DNA sequence: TGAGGTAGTAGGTTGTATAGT
DNA sequence: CAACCTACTACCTCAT
């Protein structure tokens, strides 16, 4: 029998409100067909509506919008409508949506003017209440309400082409990894070689003082000059640690804990950091918590590097791309570079004014994406680098510390699909 | 090379016990899970105040669109959406005119510009709940521009406007953070919003530009305040779609006293919540907590029974039964003095676990193909007790990300206690979507210290306070 | 003087265009 | 105070 419930609607203005009532209605018992459901590939896209508007649909529905009475298909596809409607000879067999408020009463086509109306513009539901309860004032045959068929098309019609696909791919990380380190750290009994004025930061070499020691991965004849009196200093008295027996955490004692160990090793990695850094060509931004390092304007070929941008310029400011390192042990030995942005008004002097750093760097910082954040910053590390991967980080006149450019990739399954 | 794990993007439930992804997406779809319907609006402002929230009440019922509905979808109506139905005509109000705030705002301190004009809605409020028997779901508190603007630190009055002098120099502040706090003993729910939210066409600047663009993103806020509005009423949205039932999760919450000569006294909070959260916040008492020399917070094994007890036994009358798992939220690593207090109480049964959630700055995951991050859900288990989660990122259904750069993962550490790693951040990712003031695909902090600072600011506000346990609706 | 860390503020605009050296 | 996230300063602070 006559029980499916077409309606016709305007696409693509109001194309929104077919997609909240026909899965609204599906689950309230309703057997309902729109254009919106089915997706066709068939050369006879009028045969289907024609066929199923003449012998199965019980009521045709209309969306009286604005683009709803001047779109082609709209008026043909209610054709057959008021050709059927002569058939079974019922009045109210075509009732239409009024969702659009500007349409005077003169616009509305004069197939449907004259039509019993309703009203949505006040409240949707309010519309719905009062058109239902004519569907119970003309027995139309409905199953009993169940909302389990309702979302089985949402997740099959508009949610089946955006969900978690299974493309396996890999991910490029900002941790990079250390190569080698020195074979020991060794701590020096300097006692009052080293005065209790001098600050460490001026060694030249990565220098932390202990309570009674300075730790160092330089050997103790690295630094007489800086420092003398260090000439009578004995190699016996400094107690020595092999570093891979930090790391694998085999080392612990009463008068230092590998814990303890671990956090001095981070900071001198970065002070190491900073040496060579002045070696390698960057300009330095002051920061709260660390130093940045950005590349001045021209010191590269068309301030391009490999084909990739490092430095451009907003507006009138001059903006250029930057890093500022840090280290961490767990769970591997790897260097941390992130990313940062620093703003100039002619190329070379910094703008003093952090109001605008900030301001400004989101202006542009949020329109990059993706690719532009590790196309620059898989840049800048290769220009740091020394050789074709590796960094030299100098701690020792013959102990360095290298670090390798190429970050460690993640795998993985379940990809989105790329828009 | 290692490889991570996704986790399935677990599913919260809706009215007619179906389930869906998107809150936003199966409510017009569903509606709420257990609905009340009427909603009395309790309005407390100026005349301009009324008509502003009487145009917007009066538009809620129209439909309002966003500027890219593929991300944000569209809003069909409050009674077409909930089934409770809120009328304009439906209104209790008790004035404040603008004269009375010219009298009392116009002082030369902050503290009392911001306490005199926090009086001046607390007498108003209670006595307009007590004399009339009307039961009003919500009271709504529409405060005008120009007191946000001049109630808070930092926000000097000018040398011009006063009309009364302090009377001593200055040898919380913040408005809907005290106005929050002097109604807690009487548990009444309140929501503030001002008239530069709900009237943003009326106030511009010179250019005769709006001053709060909101003409891409209208759509949106009706999903935000008009799902908020519902809740404080009495009626929760959506539970959780699937878990296994009786678990507790804890939120704990600290916070500094910058006005006290010991810098550790701070005001603790504990907050629980289930499948609901609704849940219930247990105010815990004053004690020196903070470590100025190791820096993190720490409690005293006195509060931690006094107050997980105070906790778990309204749990005992919530459900009919003691909780068999519990996990315990919070921002710093736990020491060992501090885990035996919770031992102690807890039921031989009852496995206990705490959990360290860092929004630290550990790694960045740069996709290797295409300008779109990678998809929210990978998770990277170094080993059994830590793991990274990727709460920012993608969305495959949304089609835009929630992170306007490369995301940043927040770093979950089982720091006491022993369980399975992979089940924590599958039920981590569920107290994402499970937050009721914004109605969004996900949050990037849980939710059990979604609001820890906010807590935490009501709380030191006021100290002569005895705040029992209360629900969350009546904090927000 | 720097150490680390935590909690106060500030600013931007609702985000993957399309003309064109 | 619609709200999230994510950056970054200077401030008050204690400790070494």
Known sequence: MRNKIFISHATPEDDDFTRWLSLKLIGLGYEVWCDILFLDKGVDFWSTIEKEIRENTCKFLIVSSTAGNKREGVLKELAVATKVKKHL??????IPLAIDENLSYDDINIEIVRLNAIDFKKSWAKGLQDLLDAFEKQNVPKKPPDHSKSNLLYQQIFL??????????TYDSNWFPIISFPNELRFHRYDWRLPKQFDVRTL????????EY????AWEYDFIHQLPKTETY?????????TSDILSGRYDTDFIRNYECQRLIVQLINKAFELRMKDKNVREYQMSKTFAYWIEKGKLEKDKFEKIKLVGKQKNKYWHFGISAAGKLYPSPVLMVSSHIIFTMDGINLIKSKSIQHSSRRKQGKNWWNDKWREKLLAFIRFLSDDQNAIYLNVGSEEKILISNKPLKFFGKMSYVTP | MKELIYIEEPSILFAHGQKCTDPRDGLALFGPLNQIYGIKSGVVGTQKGLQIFKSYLDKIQKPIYNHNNITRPMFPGFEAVFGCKWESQNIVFKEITDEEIRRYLFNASTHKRTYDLVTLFNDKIITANKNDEERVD???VIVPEEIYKYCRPNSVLPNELVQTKSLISKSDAQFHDQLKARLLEHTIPTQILRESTLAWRDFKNTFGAPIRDFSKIEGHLAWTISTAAYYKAGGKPWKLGDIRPGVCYLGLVYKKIEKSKNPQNACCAAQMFLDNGDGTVFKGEVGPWYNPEKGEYHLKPKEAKALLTQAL????????????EVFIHA??????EEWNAFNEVTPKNTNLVGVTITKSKPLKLYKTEGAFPIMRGNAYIVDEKKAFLWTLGFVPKLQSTLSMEVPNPIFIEINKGEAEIQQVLKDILALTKLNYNACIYADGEPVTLRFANKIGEILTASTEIKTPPLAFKYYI
Request: aromatic share 16%; proline share 3%.
């Open chain 1, 89 to 94: 000879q019922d009045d109210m067999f075509i």
């Open chain 1, 160 to 169: 089946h082409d955006k969900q978690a696909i299974e493309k396996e791919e």
């Open chain 1, 204 to 211: 030249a070499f990565p220098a932390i003082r202990y309570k």
């Open chain 1, 214 to 217: 300075l730790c160092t991965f």
């Open chain 1, 234 to 242: 004995n190699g016996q008295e400094s107690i020595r640690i092999s």
């Open chain 2, 138 to 140: 919500v009271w709504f």
């Open chain 2, 313 to 324: 036994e309204s749990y005992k009358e919530q459900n009919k039964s003691y909780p068999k």
């Open chain 2, 331 to 336: 921002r710093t690593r736990f020491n060992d």
